[PDB]
Amino acid sequence: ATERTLSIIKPDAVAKNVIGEIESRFEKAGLKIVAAKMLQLSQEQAEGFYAEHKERPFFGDLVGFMTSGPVVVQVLEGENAIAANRDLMGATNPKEAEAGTIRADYAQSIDANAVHGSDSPESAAREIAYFFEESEICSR
Amino acid sequence: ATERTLSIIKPDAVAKNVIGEIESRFEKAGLKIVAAKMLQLSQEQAEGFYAEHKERPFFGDLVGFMTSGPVVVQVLEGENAIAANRDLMGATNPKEAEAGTIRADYAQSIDANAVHGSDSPESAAREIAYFFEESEICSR
């Protein structure tokens, strides 16, 4: 079925100026960029996004790294979008990630992985609504 | 010098999902994407941006085309950016320009010509401000 998932191009990939190359991974795979914006996350913003990881000892690394630069936050829409996004991203850890995936090709570490993606249809709905309202989303 | 210029990925380009490919033409030429947002242009927005042709007989079609679907309005930064972006885009009419320009490779008609770019430093600065406050622009 056609789903919506949240994608984020992280500061490390943005700084590498490979935004184009990454968006092409999604588009060539049949995913449509349906909402997008570049911004500099504030600490309060990043924290609210990673709300579910509030108490964990790595929270400061997440939030830390995710505010280290401007990011592109965006909605990808298409057939089996959430899971396809995960397939294209590779595993969370670049060392573990299958070659040909984004994290394998572009990431250096777990903090500095090249991208983010919603891991469930539950996280999809929440993560999208957090950054975007429906008017900003342009399905096609 | 390092300058900023407004770039637009038009509804035809977005519709064919070549956002990544077009972005990679800019990034591989040394430009940086320092502001970006996807939106459906309102008729008021489209008429304001193109107010110059507001009395010409093609105005309705230009506004029509530019509101016919969602776009990516963005700011590109780098040495010679404004002129640099003009070279990459090519010539307004796809028939004229050739050999791996955006317009030649991705656009068919002058009406549906893939991308916009600011043509002069005086328009560049004003076009950027039409779409983006300075805070939205994340220089690197």
**CATH code: domain of residue B71:** 3.30.70.141
Q: Report whether A78 contacts A2 (CB < 8 A).
A: yes
Within an 8 Å CB–CB cutoff, is residue A34 touching chain B?
A: yes
Q: Report whether B13 contacts B106 (CB < 8 A).
A: yes
- Contacts (Cβ under 8 Å, ≥6 apart) of B77: B2, B3, B4, B31, B32, B33, B34, B139, B140
Domain that holds residue B72: 1-140
Q: Which residue of B has its CA nearest to A139?
A: B70
Domain count, chain B: 1
Q: Report whether B11 contacts A110 (CB < 8 A).
A: no
- Contacts (Cβ under 8 Å, ≥6 apart) of B137: B4, B34, B35, B75, B128
Spatial separation of the C-alpha atoms in residues B37 and B74, rounded to whole Å: 6
**Residue A80 region, left (φ>0) first, then alpha (ψ -120 to 50), else beta?**
left
Within an 8 Å CB–CB cutoff, is residue B133 touching chain A?
A: no
Interhelix angle A81-89/A19-28, nearest 10 degrees: 130
Count of Cβ atoms closer than 10 Å to residue B36 Cβ: 26
Count of Cβ atoms closer than 10 Å to residue B28 Cβ: 13
Helix residue spans in chain B (DSSP H):
11-15, 19-27, 43-49, 59-66, 81-89, 102-106, 121-131
Q: Which residue of A has its CA nearest to B34?
A: A38
Which residues is chain B interrupted after (C–N above 2.5 Å)?
none
Residues of B annotated as catalytic are: 116
Q: Which residue of A has its CA nearest to B75?
A: A38
Closest CA to B16 of B119, B133, B115, B126: B115
Cα Rg of chain B, angstroms: 14
Q: Is B10 annotated as a binding residue?
A: yes
Core vs surface per residue A47-79: b (16+ CB within 10 A) or e:
bebeeeeeeeeebeebbebbbbbbbbbbbbbbe
Structure obtained using:
X-ray
Within an 8 Å CB–CB cutoff, is residue B32 touching chain A?
A: yes
Asked if A37 and B36 come within 8 Å (Cβ–Cβ), the reply is yes
Spatial separation of the C-alpha atoms in residues A82 and A120, rounded to whole Å: 7
- Contacts (Cβ under 8 Å, ≥6 apart) of B136: A39, B35, B37
- Contacts (Cβ under 8 Å, ≥6 apart) of B60: none
Within an 8 Å CB–CB cutoff, is residue B15 touching chain A?
A: yes
Asked if A27 and B15 come within 8 Å (Cβ–Cβ), the reply is no
Q: Which of A102, A116, A127, A131 is catalytic?
A: A116
Closest CA to B10 of B129, B117, B122, B124: B117
Which residues is chain A interrupted after (C–N above 2.5 Å)?
none
Q: Is A86 annotated as a binding residue?
A: yes
Helix residue spans in chain A (DSSP H):
11-15, 19-28, 43-49, 59-66, 81-89, 102-106, 121-131
Spatial separation of the C-alpha atoms in residues A49 and A53, rounded to whole Å: 9
Q: What is the resolution of this structure in A?
A: 2.3
Asked if A36 and B33 come within 8 Å (Cβ–Cβ), the reply is no
Spatial separation of the C-alpha atoms in residues B121 and B128, rounded to whole Å: 11
Taking the CA of residue A55 and the nearest CA in chain B, the distance in Å comes to 30
Asked if A20 and B26 come within 8 Å (Cβ–Cβ), the reply is yes
Strand partners, B76: B5, B33
CA distances from B101 to A36, A96, B65, B74, B113 (A): 25, 38, 21, 19, 11
Asked if B69 and A27 come within 8 Å (Cβ–Cβ), the reply is no
Within an 8 Å CB–CB cutoff, is residue A53 touching chain B?
A: no
